[PDB]
Amino acid sequence: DNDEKLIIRCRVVRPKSLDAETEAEEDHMLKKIENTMLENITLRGVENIERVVMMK
Amino acid sequence: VLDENAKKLRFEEFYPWVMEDFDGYNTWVGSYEAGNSDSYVLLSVEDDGSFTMIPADKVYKFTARNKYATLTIDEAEKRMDKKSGEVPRWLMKHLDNIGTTTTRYDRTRRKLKAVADQ
Amino acid sequence: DPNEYNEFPLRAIPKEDLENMRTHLLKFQSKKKINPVTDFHLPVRLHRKDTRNLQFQLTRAEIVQRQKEISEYKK
Amino acid sequence: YIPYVKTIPKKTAIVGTVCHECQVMPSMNDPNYHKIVEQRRNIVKLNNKE
Amino acid sequence: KGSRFISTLQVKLYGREGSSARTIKATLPYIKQDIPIVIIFRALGIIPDGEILEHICYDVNDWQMLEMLKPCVEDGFVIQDRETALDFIGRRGTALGIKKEKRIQYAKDILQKEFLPHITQLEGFESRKAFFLGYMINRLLLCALDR
Amino acid sequence: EVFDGNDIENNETKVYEESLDLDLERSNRQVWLVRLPMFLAEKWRDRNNLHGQELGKIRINKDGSKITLLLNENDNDSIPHEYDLELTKKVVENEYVFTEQNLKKYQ
Amino acid sequence: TTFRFCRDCNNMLYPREDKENNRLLFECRTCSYVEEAGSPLVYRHELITNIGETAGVVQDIGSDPTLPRSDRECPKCHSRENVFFQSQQRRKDTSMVLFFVCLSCSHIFTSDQKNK
Amino acid sequence: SLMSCISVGTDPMPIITFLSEWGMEPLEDYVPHQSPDATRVFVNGVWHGVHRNPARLMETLRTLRRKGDINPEVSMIRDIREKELKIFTDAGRVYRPL
Ligand SMILES: [Zn+2]
Ligand SMILES: [Zn+2]
């Protein structure tokens, strides 16, 4: 929190077997998971709950 | 009824200009341009410092053809269909090694070398 | 004005050579330098032809080679 | 390969290379100037249709 | 003046904001199918991908618009020649009279006399059609980018 | 002027009596592409004219950067006699001029 | 993102990894041309963007009669005449910060006092 | 309204020729990357070309219409922000005097 800028760094780990064909789409796969990491991640709360406002 | 000028242009431009070298290394196809076909004029510089006047007739735009082994309509259509989620990023390189989808320049060089060897 | 310039005459081309002759403009659409005088492999041909299947048509070099073997085959 | 292409041969020759592109514009100080402007104005003024 | 008929051209941005690939497809008369814009641009005589993008975006530093255009060039990657693009258009046409050889010419007429007719309908005006098409796509992207 | 295609039979040797390769000899010739105004282009592109008469002169400053055209007095004092040739592109590339005429069909 | 384009055919270049040097190369998917990358950034997605706030500024912006005039001080030439307009972004999440264009130096500044 | 009128429309060809003679660069040689300041010129929704000095061009067009060289019903709009110059000559446009 004390850091001036809030940054998250993520790295995908490849399996023991080497996939020569996935290198072409390696960056594309990252573009896929990041998009799903922006949408399909529920940090906290109940689904279908857009916003909550406090009233007295 | 069709305007005479257009019909002549259509018949004249039915087959576009094609410029090919001896070895097929360069293949350019010309396309007619009508925006400024008749609004241009040429000035040819003589070998004595003088200028010569020649009216301009037509303007042709030439684009290179078959320089990097383009695929065919049937091959292109097969890939577009849902045979796979997305086309491979290096599909062109992969098929280059297999030997399929060669170029006219390479297709002619190999045949010429196939004769010089004997 | 002072003669601090170069002035050359401008004369029209004779019309006797403009008949049965069409002068068009050729524009190579590319970002690099294209010069058929040096870049291309002579001889070169500029004709009118159909562009259908412009990927499996015999190159001018091929026909010359095919003509040589055809003459040898016929002989 | 294909055995027929149906070409149309013609006699052609390259008779020059373009080096300069120019645009001729009448001098604004020319004595005969302000007549082209009137001619240009007449272009829109003209009403050929009857 | 001349025919008094109306032909509508639609450019659609498929996919939503949460999609990983949003491509732009254009609707042409007498084609029955939505064609990618890149194919149309190639059918108009602009094969290079760099030239096509230059027709859409008029600023070299507007990477945001280019990033949204990258899927389009990827979609039409397997078609990279004018003749190939024209044949692709012809096959989709709803004529079924062209067997195998008049398809390219049939599509040529559609792109000439029935595609954006309000500019012109005479042969030799592909440059104007391509530039106007880019303007429509550019405006579409500006709205999609909240510009 | 329809003719065979690939021509593996070598039929052009007798059908045509002239070389079919474009003459790449006059290409080393500087040419200025000039767009003319409507009033000037209407009288210079007419085929009922252009008999070889001197239509004017071109004057280039010794240091360059400024060109001007001076027409003769044959315009009938109806159009300007001086024009400023503006170089819209000092360097022009990938542009060429080619001619076109028919070939001899006999022998 | 600084999109890079091919040099031989003007096609769009794509990033590729070479294990012989563990470096970054840009290669063409059609003509087999390579070019060494200059920056390690290849993709950039901006959820909250400030690009386009001053879109439409030209050398003759002051000639527009509709644009309002103001008496604010330009902090680069000490002038009082200028035309101001709000952000051009149409998203309903942007603040009402003004953007001022000076008719003497074409310098663009902002009235923001929160972040600037 | 009382002072509103509807245009009857005229031929746009004379205006197109006039624009070309006054520096409207044709669209067949317009390179966006070599002139990222030109104003697009539209006539009846048709992109005819671009101009390098829109301010001078608009002044000439406005003066001609006011003096009576161009039909008054012709509408000219210069979108400075969008760098566009639209000229409308088709019929059916509602206008009023000011
Ligand atoms: Zn390339
Ligand atoms: Zn200032």
Curated annotation (Swiss-Prot), chain A:
DNA-dependent RNA polymerase catalyzes the transcription of DNA into RNA using the four ribonucleoside triphosphates as substrates. Largest and catalytic component of RNA polymerase II which synthesizes mRNA precursors and many functional non-coding RNAs. Forms the polymerase active center together with the second largest subunit. Pol II is the central component of the basal RNA polymerase II transcription machinery. During a transcription cycle, Pol II, general transcription factors and the Mediator complex assemble as the preinitiation complex (PIC) at the promoter. The gene is RPO21. This is DNA-directed RNA polymerase II subunit RPB1. It is found in: Nucleus. The chain holds residues 1231 to 1286 of 1733 of the full protein. It comes from Saccharomyces cerevisiae (strain ATCC 204508 / S288c) (Baker's yeast). It comes from the Eukaryota. Mutagenesis experiments demonstrate that the minimum viable CTD contains eight consensus Y-S-P-T-S-P-[A-S-N-G] heptapeptide repeats. Identical and simultaneous substitutions in a number of consecutive repeats are lethal: 'Ser-2' -> 'Ala-2' (14 repeats), 'Ser-5' -> 'Ala-5' (15 repeats), '2-Ser-Pro-Thr-Ser-5'-> '2-Ala-Pro-Thr-Ala-5' (10 repeats), 'Ser-2'-> 'Glu-2' (15 repeats), 'Ser-5' -> 'Glu-5' (12 repeats), '2-Ser-Pro-3' -> '2-Pro-Ser-3' (15 repeats) and 'Tyr-1' -> 'Phe-1' (12 repeats). There is a cross-link at K16 (Glycyl lysine isopeptide (Lys-Gly) (interchain with G-Cter in ubiquitin)).
Curated annotation (Swiss-Prot), chain C:
This is Transcription initiation factor IIF subunit alpha. Belongs to the TFIIF alpha subunit family. Phosphorylated on Ser and other residues by TAF1 and casein kinase II-like kinases. TFIIF is a general transcription initiation factor that binds to RNA polymerase II. Its functions include the recruitment of RNA polymerase II to the promoter bound DNA-TBP-TFIIB complex, decreasing the affinity of RNA polymerase II for non-specific DNA, allowing for the subsequent recruitment of TFIIE and TFIIH, and facilitating RNA polymerase II elongation. It comes from Saccharomyces cerevisiae (strain ATCC 204508 / S288c). Present with 1920 molecules/cell in log phase SD medium. Disulfide bonds: none annotated. Transmembrane segments: none annotated. Signal peptide: none annotated. TFIIF is composed of three different subunits: TFG1/RAP74, TFG2/RAP30 and TAF14. It comes from the Eukaryota. It is found in: Nucleus.
Swiss-Prot record, chain E:
DNA-dependent RNA polymerase catalyzes the transcription of DNA into RNA using the four ribonucleoside triphosphates as substrates. Second largest component of RNA polymerases II which synthesizes mRNA precursors and many functional non-coding RNAs. Proposed to contribute to the polymerase catalytic activity and forms the polymerase active center together with the largest subunit. Pol II is the central component of the basal RNA polymerase II transcription machinery. The gene is RPB2. Coiled coil: none annotated. The lineage of its organism: Eukaryota, Fungi, Dikarya, Ascomycota, Saccharomycotina. It is found in: Nucleus. Component of the RNA polymerase II (Pol II) complex consisting of 12 subunits. The binding of ribonucleoside triphosphate to the RNA polymerase II transcribing complex probably involves a two-step mechanism. The initial binding seems to occur at the entry (E) site and involves a magnesium ion coordinated by three conserved aspartate residues of the two largest RNA Pol II subunits. It comes from Saccharomyces cerevisiae (strain ATCC 204508 / S288c) (Baker's yeast). This is DNA-directed RNA polymerase II subunit RPB2. Belongs to the RNA polymerase beta chain family. The chain holds residues 246 to 392 of 1224 of the full protein.
Swiss-Prot record, chain F:
The modification Phosphoserine is found at S19. It is found in: Nucleus. Residues 1-10 have a biased composition (Acidic residues). TFIIF is a general transcription initiation factor that binds to RNA polymerase II. Its functions include the recruitment of RNA polymerase II to the promoter bound DNA-TBP-TFIIB complex, decreasing the affinity of RNA polymerase II for non-specific DNA, allowing for the subsequent recruitment of TFIIE and TFIIH, and facilitating RNA polymerase II elongation. Belongs to the TFIIF beta subunit family. Present with 520 molecules/cell in log phase SD medium. TFIIF is composed of three different subunits: TFG1/RAP74, TFG2/RAP30 and TAF14. This is Transcription initiation factor IIF subunit beta. The lineage of its organism: Eukaryota, Fungi, Dikarya, Ascomycota, Saccharomycotina. The gene is TFG2. The chain holds residues 38 to 144 of 400 of the full protein.
